[PDB]
Amino acid sequence: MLPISMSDEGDSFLVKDSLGENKIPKNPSKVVILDLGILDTFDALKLNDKVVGVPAKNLPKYLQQFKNKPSVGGVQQVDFEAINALKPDLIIISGRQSKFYDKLKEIAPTLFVGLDNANFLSSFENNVLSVAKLYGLEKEALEKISDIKNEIEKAKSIVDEDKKALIILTNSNKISAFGPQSRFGIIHDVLGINAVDENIKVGTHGKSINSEFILEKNPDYIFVVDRNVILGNKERAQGILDNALVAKTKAAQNKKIIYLDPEYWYLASGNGLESLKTMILEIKNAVK
Numbered sequence: 001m002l003p004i005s006m007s008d009e010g011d012s013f014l015v016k017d018s019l020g021e022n023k024i025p026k027n028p029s030k031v032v033i034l035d036l037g038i039l040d041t042f043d044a045l046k047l048n049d050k051v052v053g054v055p056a057k058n059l060p061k062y063l064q065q066f067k068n069k070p071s072v073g074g075v076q077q078v079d080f081e082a083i084n085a086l087k088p089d090l091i092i093i094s095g096r097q098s099k100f101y102d103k104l105k106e107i108a109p110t111l112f113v114g115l116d117n118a119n120f121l122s123s124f125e126n127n128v129l130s131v132a133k134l135y136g137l138e139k140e141a142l143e144k145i146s147d148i149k150n151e152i153e154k155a156k157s158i159v160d161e162d163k164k165a166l167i168i169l170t171n172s173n174k175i176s177a178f179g180p181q182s183r184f185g186i187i188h189d190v191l192g193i194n195a196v197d198e199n200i201k202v203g204t205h206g207k208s209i210n211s212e213f214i215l216e217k218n219p220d221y222i223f224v225v226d227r228n229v230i231l232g233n234k235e236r237a238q239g240i241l242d243n244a245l246v247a248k249t250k251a252a253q254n255k256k257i258i259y260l261d262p263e264y265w266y267l268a269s270g271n272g273l274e275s276l277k278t279m280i281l282e283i284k285n286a287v288k
């Protein structure tokens with residue numbers, strides 16, 4: 001995962017990222033943001049007035065200050081006609097919109113703020129700082145990055161190293177597991193919670209598993225991300241895991257099956273100076 005690089009050209013920056021190269025004007029004034037975390041970072045840096053389009057169909061509870069903005073669809077259902085009609089000077093995307101990069105780059109300079117699951121903290125810093133640098137706000141960004149570092153250390157200091165967690169996602173009645181360096185990796189990689197099974201190694205899709213696997217591993221914590229909440233489906237993780245095999249795990253018996261808010265974890269708000277902070281606190285409060 002290539003870090004974002006910028007070179008000053010007076011009125012504009014020459015910007016290189018994993019997907020390509022763009023000329024980005026300084027102080028862009030009409031920004032379409034498809035990544036929810038970076039939307040939150042815009043709010044944290046007081047750049048709300050620079051934003052002209054957001055994915056209103058997936059706008060979570062903590063980003064309701066952007067409901068007034070023009071909708072450019074959802075994080076997957078990108079509305080190209082809407083984006084084009086706004087005439088933006090900058091489009092910002094993450095992993096979900098990489099597939100749309102060439103069409104978006106025909107409308108305006110398109111900055112990629114991907115989170116590298118193998119290098120979460122560095123990519124996050126580089127994403128926040130590269131946005132800040134467009135506006136001259138490096139100093140504000142560093143103070144907020146330093147707040148996140150502080151929250152990380154508060155979380156870490158409370159972790160019980162004798163305990164092991166499993167991370168699962170639920171989608172319809174299907175359960176998939178995720179481990180270190182996956183899309184939920186920060187629970188293991190940044191907050192230092194031990195994985196039950198270090199050998200689950202996956203990215204965005206996950207290992208297909210069942211309630212017998214979960215009992216076999218017998219984790220002390222189960223972190224559940226229920227994709228059914230995002231997709232509107234009738235099935236609920238709470239129903240999926242209410243069975244006799246899961247009931248016998250240390251997790252069920254100690255009431256440490258923890259239902260993480262998928263508006264943060266699944267929508268992947270990790271680029272947010274305030275949303276990352278809330279996710280770190282959600283982990284910390286679930287295990288302390």
Ligand SMILES: [Fe+3]
Pocket residue numbers: none
């Ligand atoms: Fe998805």
